[PDB]
């Protein structure tokens, strides 16, 4: 029903919007690391997520480094599984190329675009896929403008070879925060956003605040991550804050995508230890995160 309806994406005006033109927001779940809860990224699940939770988004975190796709690339077809889930239960798709510790875009750069080819390739006649081609840029080393613009100026013609409009979710300094430097010099490609990312441990007015000033230039942007816990993915959850957040993005119509779909022992975490892989989870099966997520995406 959702990509049935709302089709093609495009952005217009700094604005996620749907193929009539109408502005359109995506509430949905990240996976953890697909290298170590791949166990959880499955049709069945994500058909779960989608009738019981009211998920119109799914993003496959795979991981680059720390076991991931550099270190075993057999990841990749868990990435497949969860965009041909998404396809077959016609919700939209982010393809994650989750860097973090390998903190430069750079480092893994021939990777990404032999990547981002065959996804592309493969799934760029649907409607349902969103390219992010860097999770978390990061370190005082990497900046917009000499690291990251370049980066995403050699993989958006590779994908766009195969893929003329899809959306393009490219991250930003400091760990996908530093919205500013990227809206004061956007990227051309017109169907582009830029990732923001928090967790509501942070104290949040003045990251809301450079959102806004984003916005204010005419950058689009896709809370591609976020986080009940603090920014360790730990510490305890901050549902005040969180709810800040939710209203905010409401009031932005930002789209967004929690992290994580795991059972781990740690706040962010949506499950508790007997959760199914498969789905149907009963209430005490959800963790205190779990449970205000699925609360916001149900009540939207
Ligand atoms: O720390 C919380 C999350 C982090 O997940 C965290 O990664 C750690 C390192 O791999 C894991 O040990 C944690 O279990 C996981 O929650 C995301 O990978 C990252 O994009 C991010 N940036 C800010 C916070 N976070």
New binding site residues.
């Given amino acids: 029903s959702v990509v049935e309806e709302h089709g093609q994406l495009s952005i217009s005006n700094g604005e996620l919007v749907n193929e009539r033109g109408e502005q359109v927001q995506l509430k949905g779940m990240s996976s953890?690391?697909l290298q170590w809860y791949g166990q959880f990224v499955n049709y069945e699940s994500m058909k779960w997520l989608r009738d019981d939770w009211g998920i119109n988004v799914f993003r496959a975190?795979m991981?680059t480094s720390?076991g991931g796709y550099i270190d075993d690339p057999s990841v990749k077809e868990k990435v497949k599984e969860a965009v041909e889930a998404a396809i077959d239960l016609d919700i939209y798709v982010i393809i994650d190329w989750?860097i973090?510790?390998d903190n430069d875009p750079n480092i893994y750069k021939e990777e990404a675009k032999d990547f981002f080819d065959e996804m592309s390739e493969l799934y760029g006649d649907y409607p349902n896929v969103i390219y992010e081609i860097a999770?978390?840029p990061n370190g005082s080393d990497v900046t917009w403008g000499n690291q990251i613009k370049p980066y995403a100026e050699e993989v958006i013609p590779i994908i766009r070879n195969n893929d003329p409009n899809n959306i393009i979710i490219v991250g930003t300094g400091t760990?996908?925060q530093d919205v500013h430097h990227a809206a004061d010099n956007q990227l051309a490609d017109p169907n582009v956003m830029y990732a923001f990312?928090f967790?509501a441990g942070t104290h949040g007015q003045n990251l809301r605040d450079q959102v806004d000033y984003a916005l204010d230039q005419g950058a689009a942007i896709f809370v591609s991550?976020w986080?009940t816990?603090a920014?360790?993915?730990?510490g305890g959850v901050f549902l005040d804050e969180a709810q800040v957040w939710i209203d905010f993005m409401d009031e932005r119509n930002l789209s967004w995508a929690n992290?994580?779909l795991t059972h781990?022992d740690?706040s962010?975490?949506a499950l508790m230890p007997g959760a199914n892989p498969t789905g149907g989870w009963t209430e005490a099966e959800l963790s205190p995160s779990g449970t205000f997520v699925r609360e916001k995406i149900r009540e939207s």
């Fill in positions: 953890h690391g975190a991981y720390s989750h973090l510790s999770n978390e760990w996908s990312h967790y991550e986080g816990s920014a360790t993915g730990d992290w994580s781990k740690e962010s975490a």
